[PDB]
Amino acid sequence: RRDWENPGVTQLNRLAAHPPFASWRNSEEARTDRPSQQLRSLNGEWRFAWFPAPEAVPESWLECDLPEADTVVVPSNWQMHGYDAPIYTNVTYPITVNPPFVPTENPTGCYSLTFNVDESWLQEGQTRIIFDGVNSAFHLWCNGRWVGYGQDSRLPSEFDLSAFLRAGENRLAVMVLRWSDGSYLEDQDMWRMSGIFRDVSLLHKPTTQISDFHVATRFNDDFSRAVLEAEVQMCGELRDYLRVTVSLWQGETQVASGTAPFGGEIIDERGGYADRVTLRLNVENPKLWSAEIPNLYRAVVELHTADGTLIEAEACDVGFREVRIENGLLLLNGKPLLIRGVNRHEHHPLHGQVMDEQTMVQDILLMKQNNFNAVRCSHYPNHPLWYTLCDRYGLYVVDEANIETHGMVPMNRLTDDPRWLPAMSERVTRMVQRDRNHPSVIIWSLGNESGHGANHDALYRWIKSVDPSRPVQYEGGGADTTATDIICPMYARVDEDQPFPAVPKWSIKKWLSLPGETRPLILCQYAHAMGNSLGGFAKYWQAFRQYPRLQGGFVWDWVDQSLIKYDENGNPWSAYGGDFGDTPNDRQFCMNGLVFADRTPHPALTEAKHQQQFFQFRLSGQTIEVTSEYLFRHSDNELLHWMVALDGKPLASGEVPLDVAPQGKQLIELPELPQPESAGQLWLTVRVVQPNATAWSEAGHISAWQQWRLAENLSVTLPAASHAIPHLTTSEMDFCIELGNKRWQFNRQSGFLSQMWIGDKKQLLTPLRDQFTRAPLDNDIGVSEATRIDPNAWVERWKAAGHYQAEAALLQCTADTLADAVLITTAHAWQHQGKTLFISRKTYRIDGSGQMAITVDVEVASDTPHPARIGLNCQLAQVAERVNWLGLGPQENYPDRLTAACFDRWDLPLSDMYTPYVFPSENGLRCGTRELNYGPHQWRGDFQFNISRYSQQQLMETSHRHLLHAEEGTWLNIDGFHMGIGGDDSWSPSVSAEFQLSAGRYHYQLVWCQK
Template sequence: MTQTLAQILARRDWENLGVIAVNRLSMHAPLQFWHKNEKPVYGQKSNNESVLNGEWQMSYFDQPEHVPETWLQTDLVTGDKITVPANWQLQGDYDVPIYTNVTYPIPVKPPDVPEQNPTGAYSKVFNLPEDWLSAGYVHVTFDGVGSAFYLWLNGEFIGYSEDSRLPAEFDLTSAVQLGENRLCVLVLRWSKGTYLEDQDMWRLSGIFRDVTLRHLPEQHLLDYYVTTTLDADFDQAIVSVQTKSTADVFIQAALYWQNTLVATQINSPGTEAIDERGANPNALQLDLIVDKPYLWSDELPHLYELVLTVSDKNKVVTHIEHVQVGIRKVAIVNGLLTLNGKPLLIRGVNKHEFHPEKGYAIDETTMRRDIALLKQNHFNAVRLSHYPNQQRWYELANEYGILLVDEANIETHGMIPMNLLTDDVNYLPQMLARLTRMVLRDRNFPAIILWSLGNESGYGHNHDALYQWLKQTDTTRPVQYEGGGADTIVTDIIAPMYARVSEDQCFPVNTKWSLKRWISKPGEQRPLILCEYAHDMGNSLGGFDRYWQAFRQFERLQGGFIWDWVDQGLAKDGDYAYGGDFGDSPNDRQFSLDGLLFPDRTAKPALQEVAYQQQYLQFRWLNGQLSVRSEYLFKTTDATLTYTIVVDGKPMKEESLTLKLPPETKKDIVVCLPKIGQQDVFLNIKVTQNVSTIDLPAGHLLAEEQFVLQRKTQFVSLPVTDRPMVVETSHAVMITSRHNKWYFDTDTGWLTQWLKDGEQQFITPLQDHFTRAPIDNDIGVSEVANPDPNAWEARWHDAGWFNLSAQLDDFAIAKVGAFIEVQTIHHFLAGHEQVLSSRKTYRFNADGMYLTVDVSRNINSLPPARVGLQVQVGIFDGLSYVGRGPLENYPDRHSGARMGYWTQTLDELTTPYIFPSENGLRTAVSSLHWGSHHILAPQTPLQIGASRYSEKALIQAKHRTALVADAGVWLNLDGQHMGVGGDDSWSPSVASEYLLTAPFYHYELMWTVN
């Protein structure tokens, strides 16, 4: 008896733990059913496939029970056109996107969800070719639907599915008809599966991956499983192919290398290789021997092609499958994760499937753009955080050489305790389905080197079952899982999150161990790979070089996965939205903006640091000899090395030579230096690729390095000129020369104005400056409801640092030889506490001033964010400086920057973080000039910044588009600047050596206007 829509919904499958799916077919490897005469192309569809992407009809309801019965027969007048694949929250005036990190977006009452459950009633009309109806089967596959859906065809109920990140396949054969067919899909935003999908991401829903119809011949493959086994010397491989199929077929496996047949075998199911009695009519194993195989790796992603040909009992070919095969061996040997016998160093990143306009719907163009950027910046691995990706991503990873961690779509971060569900046997079938279906789909992809049981779900007995199933099902890959302390019995790899290099972190519940403590644990021999580290939220990634020093020093520290790849900012009103911008509640604000890339895939400055630290070529300079060492494990470097000797910003000598460097070897190069006087001398090295490869074009920059061979000593003093005159009034002092006038306010002690030939140079007084617009790491919030009281922003705010009051203690003016000297002493109070004092000595000649600043700090007070000066000057287009560049860099994030003579515009000097904050600093600046202004740092270099936006504006604005440029340019001249940190973004992470905790600071500068 046919059930009505109401009767089906009354079952409430979405809240029933006994229901995983209804009528959903078993998971299997990807199948495309190519015809014999078709030429297959990976990423394209066969003639036996029809994609239903494009325009669909959708009606939106606030709960499924409000969908009328008539919807199954005809589209509703309330419906709209909608694009598939996409998320409905991004296509119309429906419910809103919700961004939350840990907190569930619904009341936590598992397995129940709210009655108000946003629902999309989708429909699509399609026609089938007549030959699809005459024989065989018709299936439909939904590659990704969130979070649960019901399916009907021509009014007939087909099935139900959960797990938003894996394909759901259904047999439509009994319901399809000649002519028009109407597919109805009822998508629910919330289901019991929501409790297993509490990932740090935008919570969106809808049909967001491909929908594909497939025609299956009567005799066909049901599944296949390819494994590769190598001998001890890696000289011979066995490619084993296990298949399941319908009965009465012959299956031929043919392995090709670049269109040349390597090995082939044909047999019929039921052979003893799979079943000693020959009693399994559907199973078959074929073994192909490959001598001297080309091995697959991330560096050399050699792929064979396996062609599986299915024939009926009359030897008529029914269909063909084409499979990428990478022959490689992943194993843990002597405590090290190895690939083809070589210990790996994971240069990894976590990556969500995210597009700023399309949400979860990722097109191939975006995938290829991501892979190009990964390769260009020396990444070799991606953790698929925190769910299986769409099939095409794995194929591209196979092709281009990206090591993958495939992760089950399981996260229960917001449960209290976190393992409440993962330790509940009632949830075991739900969890097991998510893991097993992922493995059965993905196990043939050679790019996958690790399986993951999920993310941040604590440790429960259900994990034991998942781990044991994996170890029995796939012996070719280790298992990684962080939950429960990073070293439970269900992980083959110690996989901590955000462990610091040397410092343990003491938390109320437990202590988070440092990396060095982990690898020193007695009896522990597993490799350590950080599943997440280096949280790049906003202006971050300070101290990143410390991790890479440790990775290269300690063999069992085998790298990690940065968090994360791209800012999750959704396009809105000409910019990118974060949590709360859609009125979504709960939300975790800008915690979604923690990628190395902006949402449009343009790079943040921190990526420069990452690329430098991860580059495969390492350099050393000693006594006129340059040593180049390769960290490639398999690839010979075929490149051009160019070294340039730069003297005072100008190339003096340049030489290029061919660099043929086998893997894991080094080469020494003698560099003859010319005779040079007291000048800046930099040795710049660039290595560029000679020939194009699949992943990188010819001419691509493989590595760069710089050695500062000499800095010129700047014995700078203010030239003797005609001594300026002094004019004193009751509240001011004017120092005047032929072309310049300087004004001091004797009540405040500030240098308030500088006139050059009557033209104002200052818009605001030149003042001491000790704060910065808090960066995300200063704010220290991963959950809005749980801010860190020890965060720097909170401590500075509570102590009154953003409202420091300056008290003038002394103002003195004197004639000193040919100069006028002004000395001021200011005390700075936070509330009633004196926290800082600044003594400034200005020495003026006719053309400029020499300024000496001595700052003393109350050692019982907080350290400041900076010790420097700030002034707003007239607008200019850009400036030139000698210092580190070309991109923004900070005291604890500058190893990837180069010393140089740089000229940059104001836009280039500013980093447009979506959530405004301190940005744009340049370190080690010995001189700068713009227009007729020249500033020298004669003793120790300065840190400088120039921006159209005031610190106050940066603090008050919640989006960069809300910033209004001032009339002039805010110039920061810092003697010292605090680091940015970035081990994580929710606890103070700036290393002690980059905190301004010294009792005294001194800096000098000379400023002239020509």
């Protein structure tokens, strides 16, 4: 049969889909969500054997274990056990595109399990097996007899084993095909793996059972009254003595209960459903569910007899909330949402695509701690526990069908073809059937990157028809097609249009107002967090706040899809595309997360946290106005802390309880802040602290912050008469300056400061030179590759211009002695293929105090690409333990990504000054720095800097962080100016004009002195 090369066969003998069941036989257990004796896990140790194709599978395997098999844990992806390599390809399918056929060499995983079954399960009722996730298709045999087949790697497949099992020991055999016609619908940008990767279980249900149930909650105009309506269907023999009771509980309190015999209302000329019943329960003043306060009730559905004997019970958590689009706005409980979302793939660096509760809870907690209120299931239905957790912790979810055909040409080749309508419809319909009772799901999505075809239009209407309670979205075909209730583009910029033909990506602000357009706009993916990125994140947030119809978005994405590999000494390291011998591959494009694979945050997460704050502040005089962005709760677990500091030196602070209604404001008068006897800048910092711990945060959690510069007192105080005067020694090749136990040497042919001594100790490993380049970020590189250069990428514009090859030419080097100091003057030109790219003019003035004042004036040819930076650099001979600076921090910050950083005095171990991006590049800059301390040196001025054991050269020559090695000494990069990092996307230049170094002439000055 070759059922795995026929989109017309997506399954054989598979049971209908339905919401999570457990068949409790005790109502209270159902109410409490406790473990059910009728639902057994078959997870654990299985037998497994790998074959290169299904044809190679021995027939004996159906009857008995293969001696060559191994014993492995299930769920798992077999690539993670080393049986074959996982492949990282983004768009291009991992197999030849020739639908619906798959390669003849098709890795086949033969899993088997010998286990026991009690007669009690067989003597009555139905015993089914449930495979929550099998990638990508499989055949199932039980005791050597063929049971059935299933496709869709992301939804459960269940089969009735009642007639196949026997009391005692039984054997399951499952042949899993890596590739199948299902693969053409699974072209998501993620590792391509396979296997039994989600749970396997056995479920026992009575012959007469609850086969489906749907819960709806409708409200009156102000949400002070609701009706809970639960439709219940049965399978089995109808009998008049049968009943269904549906009860609603708020904790231990029973809120409502209704009982009815089967028999629905008349539907049409042939009657109604004799096998269904709908119970309707009124609820006054329901506690409403939202991500702010995830109030939940428990619905218990009991199937029983008139005399009271329970047959079985099913149940679910219920959240009272209405989701609707009106007048162009997405409302939840009648208030317009502001989605602070993120797309999250199911990824574990060691377990591959196998999810576990601990990881899930770790993700959720980090999300809520960082002010996210929503998640999109990019790009398939998730493991079932995820929805339970979103329901209870409180996150709005976009549940998305496992349909992605990105690699087709054109993208809608299959989605517009009716012969693929059935397979696609199963991917949508079965998801809705399984997840429609979860209150956390607020929007359905038809899949991802599959163009726009008529099949999407058919399925969009199917959903709208079956479940009017939730909007339907879909980005394919241009983001605003007839298959979406929400304009949901990916990577559309804030102000800049990208008018691609047929599927233009307009500026979001302009998109909203195109002729005839009225829908809300929520980006399905925005701000690509690959490497050092998130530049321009604030721009989105300012627009979402200013424009009602701009309702937010899902950042791309939560966690890097890096996998762990082990070196020669068995040490682990983070790998990406190509690292398993997979080819073609898309290299580092699999790492786009706000957190690394092991959940440590990237610095960008803090920028997200800050922009997504729920409290806004303005300052006026001594007055602070706090405005709450919560729609439903009062700030009842919040206090405001404030502190006033001069140049990092705290002068005063205090705290004020916050009591602001949702959407309201609170004024807070700060007490008279005394004046200050000292030059410097006074800064006010406020933080919102949650005094009490919550289900997702600890006591003392800071949820928001903001700063303002208050007065500044410029220094007008004259240094003081130098104790001594520096001496200049001139030789043919050098200018030397001596002062006390310090000496500076300037080489007359190079024109740079080549050496500095403190006593007899040399302080430099390489001379102090201008630097106009940076080891390229992922955003600077984009898609450019040696085999296919993208001449438009920043890195290629820089290379081509000669930025990385340009050599300094001396134009001038002079020394003069002044009354109290020595002045060195230098000028250099940087040229390439005879063009002058940059000209740097400087003065060094060394005085009686031993301070060295450096002034730098640079010219940049208007016709060369704007440079990555304009600074100086050097390799210091010293290695010191800490770094202390008065500037923005404490974490890495760049020009277009520094809103979350605060101006203060920070002190960190040197290694915290380096960001271990998997793919190395320029990293760890801190901007807005007035003073920097390292070892006995001190630099003062107004600059940006980074300091670490790695040279730019090394970072730009190294592709994996595990291969970097500390160089002798410390590399110090001190910049007058640094280009933004961008990140709107990572494949097209995205650094905003206001963040490019295009002024033509730049000036900066620093004072180097000994401390």
